[PDB]
Design a protein around this ligand. Structure first.
Ligand SMILES: Nc1ncnc2c1ncn2[C@@H]1O[C@@H]2COP(=O)(O)O[C@H]2[C@H]1O
Length: 201
DNA sequence: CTTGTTATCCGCTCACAATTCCACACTAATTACGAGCCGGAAGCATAAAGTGTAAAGCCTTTTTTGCCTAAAATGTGATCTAGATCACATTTATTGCG
């Protein structure tokens, strides 16, 4: 449909792992779209602690905020998590496609609504719910993600002990303590990054 | 031889000054006077209907002030679990290469 009409003017260019698709400081002159794989977006402070806002899997767009208002810069950093195939379309030639077919814009701004609902309703849980409650909800949220692999016992995901604290809002030390505590009670499992939870499904 | 028109000459009335900015300093003479006349206005107070101004005399509406106190917001500090904090040491999992 409209999606196929979008790939007719794209520029196929594969990006290796640990690459740089979006550099905070450069000029936004290329729209990116995810075909296969996944990518992560995060920011940094003055020390070195990271902070992931939201994850973007396949079928999502990369850097679309610098399209509505011409003359902007890259907000956050976008590092390629895994081998992903991303297209390339200049914003200049994109604006001409909207004036002749606004329907194409109805697709991009359609995914910008869900990314706001999962963030606004998350703040409330990061002010009342304790560590046990915040992490508990996170386990189910990551299980609903398409990048999650089906497990005979439950769900198998791969996330570090830092990214967890960046979602529930806490220190990295606290995460490791509770994580190992649930292991003794036979509730979940962890072997570095891969965390297999139980009770799901 | 005398006459005409024509050409040359003169004095005359006639038409006719064009390289381009600024500064400093300086400058005007003369018709006889006196007495009598009517003129405008000096601005005087007057006075009136008409007009537009300038006191402040109680009403009504707004706006700051001081008021009361019923109901909601606010420290007391010593103990106690769930939270946070640094640096930069060492250990860990990411996508490939060969
Ligand atoms: N919380 C978020 N949810 C979804 N996308 C994001 C989020 N934060 C940053 N991004 C994307 O990261 C991109 C960084 O570059 P852009 O400003 O071009 O566009 C930004 C967004 O598209």
């Amino acid at each position: 449909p409209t999606l196929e009409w979008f790939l007719s003017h794209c520029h196929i260019h594969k990006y290796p792992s640990k690459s740089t698709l979006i550099h905070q400081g450069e000029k936004a002159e290329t729209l990116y779209y995810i075909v296969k794989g996944s990518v992560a977006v995060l920011i940094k402070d003055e020390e070195g602690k990271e902070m992931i806002l939201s994850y973007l899997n396949q079928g999502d767009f990369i850097g679309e905020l610098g399209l509505f208002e011409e003359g902007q810069e890259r907000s956050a950093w976008v590092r390629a998590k895994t081998a992903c195939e991303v297209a390339e379309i200049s914003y200049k030639k994109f604006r001409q496609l909207i004036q002749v077919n606004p329907d194409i814009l109805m697709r991009l701004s359609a995914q910008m609504a869900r990314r706001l609902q999962v963030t606004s309703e998350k703040v409330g849980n990061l002010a009342f719910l304790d560590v046990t409650g915040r992490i508990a909800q996170t386990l189910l949220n990551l299980a609903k993600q398409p990048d999650a692999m089906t497990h005979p016992d439950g769900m198998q995901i791969k996330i570090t002990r830092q990214e967890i604290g960046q979602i529930v809002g806490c220190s990295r030390e606290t995460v490791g303590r509770i994580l190992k505590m649930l292991e003794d009670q036979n509730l979940i499992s962890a072997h570095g990054k891969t965390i297999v939870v139980y009770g799901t499904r």
